[PDB]
């Protein structure tokens with residue numbers, strides 16, 4: 457199971473780890489992807505998860521978009537987890553760098569409540585442009601299910617833990 461996670465709250469845990477490597481090791485029921493509305497997994501967590509699936513995640517995502525159209529910012533869809541997890545929950549947090557509404561971050565985290573346990577990144581953090589300290593705060597105040605956060609950056613991980621209220 458999940459190991460080496462620091463407990464933040466009753467249900468939120470955090471570790472300095474590459475979510476791809478965490479996924480290959482744990483093979484959780486659900487890995488969360490930091491998706492965009494088009495499921496175009498180019499960079500950040502999405503690009504890394506997709507590259508780990510040998511592009512099978514992108515092929516599956518393009519078929520999903522061809523059938524269903526784009527997701528909403530704050531929305532999600534459940535697709536295969538391929539070699540990483542049983543399922544991948546593609547969650548669209550607002551991309552501040554693309555001018556999207558930061559108020560949608562709480563709606564994005566509400567998607568996690570449909571799954572008992574998840575391996576996840578901090579939504580809207582990294583190349584999405586939001587303040588990761590704010591994202592962790594919204595996570596612990598929104599998610600009620602068991603969330604194991606993987607923070608790739610060591611220096612950001614230290615900053616998140618040492619500043620956690």
Ligand SMILES: c1cnc2ncccc2c1
Pocket residue numbers: 474475476500501504582608
């Ligand atoms: C490999 C490469 N880029 C990453 N970016 C964000 C999170 C995890 C990653 C792993």
